[PDB]
């Protein structure tokens, strides 16, 4: 039976163009389905969606990030996709459960993850060789990493860290290497109860900065764009970033760059499969089955992914991930291979950012600067941070 399906997403023009081709491919294969696409840049997208939420007129397939996933989900606007994953509609046989965890709110699958990124240590291989150093990514520890950064400074005259900013990403990574977490599951306070974890993390940051193998805050504040960034300029041999950012860095840099598993990820599976973005279906949709079939095509059809080519992150299906590599250049292939390697020892996505998250972020950023400026001790800072952070979170 003929049907019209409304499909919405955000991005820039390249994404619009290949997404349109994917849609045309779907209509070519399924001529009973007629698709009306709505798209905009990020700013405009959410503005355009708000009045459709209002009138119960959301498109049948809508692209989401985790933050709006949580907002729409909490307002009961989104259809649980779980049954579609059981009843044959969305095939998840080549999609590990951990890939999809980022779309799960309150045990409901409100969004289907379209691609993932994973934290990495990205290295300039030429500068590793100039220093005569090497990274054994399997099992290296925080001490090994510290020693690496000193060797980089002493023997190659460059930094071994880009600064591990922002701290709201990398201190939580640290805590996970230690079998700990930053936020409580319920969002009401800090999970970790030992301030020594904070002290240990930031005492290391100080050592690195004091040893001149990580930037001082003023240096960090001068970096405007990616063409200024430390790895791009050869100022650091090391940059800490999600896997997708490697593409940007590699196109801008002369030197061969590689992605490495960060230190001490192994024992507690500290890395997570972070969703790039998700497709959701509103409860108001009159075509929820056809919307789910489109989502399935989008994630499992290999011909379609020959067009998408990992632009929305590394494909959640290991079959699709492997199938696109022949068409990807080396740098894009490196990203896929990295994530595939990381995914062998990895944890589910974190839960949704709790309310008050933006203030905690700023608090931790200001706290880090004061520590590196030595305006406050790491000991003292651990205490005031816990107190302020818990007061913010206690409000939710
Ligand atoms: Na390739």
- φ, ψ dihedrals at 183, nearest 5°: -95, 140
Last residue of a domain, one of 318, 340, 362: 340
Closest CA to 353 of 115, 70, 78: 70
Together in a domain, 238 and 302: no
- Dist. CA 338 → ligand 1 center (Å): 13
- Backbone breaks in the chain after residues (C–N over 2.5 Å): none
| 79, 160: one domain | no
Helices (H), 110-141: 125-131
User: Could you tell me the distance, in angstroms and rounded to a whole number, from the CA of residue 83 to the centre of ligand 1?
Assistant: 35
**Separation of 329 CA from ligand 1 center, angstroms?**
5
Residue 229 shares a structural domain with residue 362: yes
Claim to verify: residue 295 and residue 346 sit in the same structural domain: no
Residues 361, 240 share a domain = yes
**CA 328 – ligand 1 centroid, Å:** 4
Q: Are residues 122 and 218 in the same domain?
A: yes
Distance 176 CA to ligand 1 centre (A): 32
Going from the C-alpha of 15 to that of each of 5, 9, 243, 351, 358, the distances in angstroms are 19, 9, 19, 27, 29
Q: Which of 380, 387, 350 is nearest to 117 (CA)?
A: 350
Buried b or exposed e, range 140-163, using 16+ CB within 10 angstroms: bebeebbebbbbbbeebebbbbbb
330 CA → ligand 1 middle, Å: 5
65 — phi, psi (to 5°)?
-100, 175
Instruction: Dig out the tokens for 229 from the structure.
Output: 């960034």
Q: Are residues 19 and 86 in the same domain?
A: yes
Task: Tell me: cis bond preceding 75? Omega within 30 of 0 counts.
Answer: no
Rounded distance from Cα 315 to ligand 1 centre (Å): 15
**What pairing do the DSSP bridges indicate for beta strands 61-64 and 3-10?**
parallel
Distance (angstroms) between ligand 1 centre and the Cα of 305 equals: 14
Ligand 1 centroid distance, CA of 248 (Å): 17
> The tokens of 220 are what?
């960090």
- What is the C-alpha to C-alpha distance for residues 126 and 130, in angstroms, rounded to an integer? 6
**From ligand 1's centre to the CA of 27, what distance in Å?**
28
At residue 352's C-alpha, the angle toward residues 240 and 298, to 5°, is 80
Residue 247 shares a structural domain with residue 180? yes
- From which experimental method does this structure derive? X-ray
List the domain range (segments joined by +) for residue 307. Answer: 1-114+276-340
Last residue within a domain, chosen from 340, 365, 386: 340
Nearest to 301 by CA among 59, 29, 18, 9: 29
Chain mean position to CA 199: 26
The answer on 374 and 326 residing in a single domain is no
Half-sphere exposure of 123 (CA within 13 A, CB side): 23
- Separation of 323 CA from ligand 1 center, angstroms? 10
Q: How far, in Å, from the CA of 327 to the mean position of ligand 1?
A: 5
Same domain (yes/no): 128, 85: no
Resolution for this model in angstroms, one decimal place?
1.9
- 203 and 349 inside one domain: yes
Q: Of 304, 323, 340, which residue is a domain's last? A: 340
Residue 311: CATH number of its domain:
3.40.190.10
Which residues fall inside 5 Å of ion ligand 1, going by CB? 325, 328, 333
Q: How many domains does the chain have?
A: 2
Q: What is the whole-number distance in angstroms between the Cα of residue 343 and the centre of ligand 1? A: 19
**What tokens does 352 get?**
């949704």
On whether both 360 and 320 belong to a single domain, the answer is: no
Q: Please give the distance, rounded to the nearest whole angstrom, from the Cα atom of residue 307 to the centre of ligand 1.
A: 14
């Amino acid at each position: 039976e003929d049907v019209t399906l409304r499909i919405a997403w955000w991005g820039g023009q390249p994404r619009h163009d290949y997404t349109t081709k994917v849609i045309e491919l779907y209509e070519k294969k399924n001529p009973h389905v007629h698709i009306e696409a709505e798209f905009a840049n990020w700013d405009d997208y959410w503005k355009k969606l708000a009045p459709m939420s209002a009138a119960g007129q959301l498109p049948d397939v809508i692209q989401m990030d985790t933050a709006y996933l949580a907002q729409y989900g909490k307002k009961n606007q989104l259809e649980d996709l779980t049954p579609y994953t059981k009843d044959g509609t969305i095939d998840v046989s080549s999609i590990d459960e951990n890939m999809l965890s980022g779309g799960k709110i309150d045990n409901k699958l409100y969004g289907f993850t379209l691609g993932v990124n994973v934290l990495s240590v990205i290295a300039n291989e030429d500068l590793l060789k100039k220093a005569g150093v090497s990274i054994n990514q399997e099992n290296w520890t925080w001490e090994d990493y510290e020693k690496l950064a000193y060797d980089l400074q002493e023997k190659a005259g460059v930094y071994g860290s880009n600064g591990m900013h922002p701290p709201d990403i990398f201190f939580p990574y640290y805590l996970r290497t230690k079998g700990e977490r930053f936020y409580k599951e319920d969002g009401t306070g800090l999970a970790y109860q030992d301030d020594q974890l904070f002290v240990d993390y930031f005492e290391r940051q100080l050592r690195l900065v004091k040893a001149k193998t990580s930037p001082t805050p003023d240096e960090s504040a001068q970096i405007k764009g990616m063409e200024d960034d430390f790895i791009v300029k050869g100022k650091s041999a090391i940059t800490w970033n999600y896997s997708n950012q490697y593409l940007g860095f590699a196109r801008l840099t002369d030197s061969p760059l590689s992605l490495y598993l960060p230190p001490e990820q192994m024992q507690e599976k500290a890395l997570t499969l972070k969703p790039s973005m998700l497709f959701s279906i509103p409860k108001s949709s009159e075509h929820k089955k056809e919307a789910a079939k489109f989502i399935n095509f989008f994630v499992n059809n290999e011909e379609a992914n020959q067009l998408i080519k990992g632009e929305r992150g590394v494909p959640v299906s290991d079959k699709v991930a492997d199938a696109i590599k022949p068409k990807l250049n080396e740098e894009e292939t490196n990203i896929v291979e990295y994530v595939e390697t990381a995914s062998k020892n990895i944890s589910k996505a974190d839960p949704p950012e709790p309310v008050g998250s933006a203030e905690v972020i700023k608090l931790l950023k200001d706290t880090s600067d004061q520590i590196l400026y030595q305006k406050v001790s790491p000991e003292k800072a651990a205490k005031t941070f816990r107190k302020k952070a818990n007061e913010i979170l206690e409000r939710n």
